[PDB]
Amino acid sequence: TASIAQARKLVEQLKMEANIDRIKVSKAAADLMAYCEAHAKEDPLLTPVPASENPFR
Amino acid sequence: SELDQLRQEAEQLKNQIRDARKACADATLSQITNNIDPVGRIQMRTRRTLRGHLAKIYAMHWGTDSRLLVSASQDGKLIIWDSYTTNKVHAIPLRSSWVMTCAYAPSGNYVACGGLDNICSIYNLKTREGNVRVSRELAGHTGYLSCCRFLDDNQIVTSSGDTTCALWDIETGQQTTTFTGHTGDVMSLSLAPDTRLFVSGACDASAKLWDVREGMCRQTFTGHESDINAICFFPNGNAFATGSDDATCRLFDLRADQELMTYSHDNIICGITSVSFSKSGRLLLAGYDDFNCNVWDALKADRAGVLAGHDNRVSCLGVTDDGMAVATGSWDSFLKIWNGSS
C-alpha cells in the first residue's frame, strides 16, 4: 500500500512549510505601497506618457 | 492505526499553519490603502491589431526588448510579431497544432512551445542557415504542457498536466529538477524577477511557491474555489496574483504567506484566463471569458478601465518589459496592443 508513503510525505511537506518566518501584513503592505509609489512615475500605464513618446502612436 | 494518526497529525499541522497565518494577519490591504488616491478611469486604445492567425490564440509572450512578441495558435503556427510595425518576423510551423503555451527567451535567441503533444519544443531563431528550426524537443512530461518559461538560454521550467512542474536543461534535454506536490493539473507558472523562485497555479485551487535550486515547494497558498488558470509575480517579486475559474483574482504574498486582496465583482461570473501586472505593479490586467479584459487596481480592487473590444474570449495577456503597452490575444485569432494616452 502506497497510501502510508503519501501520508508520510505530505506530513513532511507540512512540517517544512510550518517552519517559515512570517512577517506581519502591515510591513508587507507598506513594502508593496512603497514599491508602487516609487515606480509610479516610470510606469507608462499608470501615468500615460505623451503621444509623442508612445511607440504605438 | 498508523496512517490514521499520521493524517491526524497532518490535519493538526494544517490547523497550526492556518492559525499562524490568522495571528500574523493584523490588518488587511483594504484598510491600509484606503486613503491612497485612486487611479481613476483608465482608457486604453487598440493601437495595433496583429491579425494573421487563422485559429484561436492560446498563449503569447513579450520579448525582452518590449518590441517582439511570439503568439501561438491552434493553427499550428507560432508567429513572431514586430509589434511596432505589425510585421511577421517569423512563422514557425509547429509539429503538433495542439499548442497551449509559448515563451520568449530573455536573450531573445530561443522560443518554446508545447501543448497536448507532451513535448516542450524549443526553436532557435538566430541561425546561420537563416531559418528557424527546433533545437531540443524536451520529452518526459506525462501530462499536456500548460506553461513554459525560460530561466536562461539553457534552462527552462515547464508546467504540465501530470500534476508536476519540471526544470529542464536544454543542452542535455533531461529534467534537472522535478517539482511534485500538486493534486490537480498545473495550468500556469510565473518566474520571479530575481529568477531564484517561481510560483505555479494548479487545478486543485492552490498555488505553490517552488525553489529552482532546492527543488521542492517552499510555500503553498489556498483560497480559490475553482481551478487556477493564470499566475503573475508582482514586479518586486514579493507577491503574485492568481486568475481562477470562479471569477475572482487573488493577490497572495510570499512573505506574509497569505492572501492580501481579492478582485471580484458581482457582474462578472466568467473565470479569468490570463493575468499580468503593470510595470509599477499598480494595475493588474486580467483576461476573462466574457470577451473582455479588465484592468484592476492592485491596491484598491477597483475596476478601472475595460479592454472590451476583442469579440471573443481572451486567452493570453502580456505587459511589456518596460510597461509601455499591453498585448491581449483571444480566440478570434487577433492580437491587440493597448496603451494609455494623455
Author numbering:
A (entry chain G): 6 to 62
B (entry chain B): 2 to 343
Show sentences the authors wrote.
Free fatty acid receptors 1 to 4 (FFA1 to FFA4) are class A G protein–coupled receptors (GPCRs). However, FFA1 and FFA4 are activated by long-chain fatty acids, while FFA2 and FFA3 respond to short-chain fatty acids generated by intestinal microbiota. FFA1, FFA2, and FFA4 are potential drug targets for metabolic and inflammatory conditions. Here, we determined the active structures of FFA1 and FFA4 bound to docosahexaenoic acid, FFA4 bound to the synthetic agonist TUG-891, and butyrate-bound FFA2, each complexed with an engineered heterotrimeric Gq protein (miniGq), by cryo–electron microscopy.
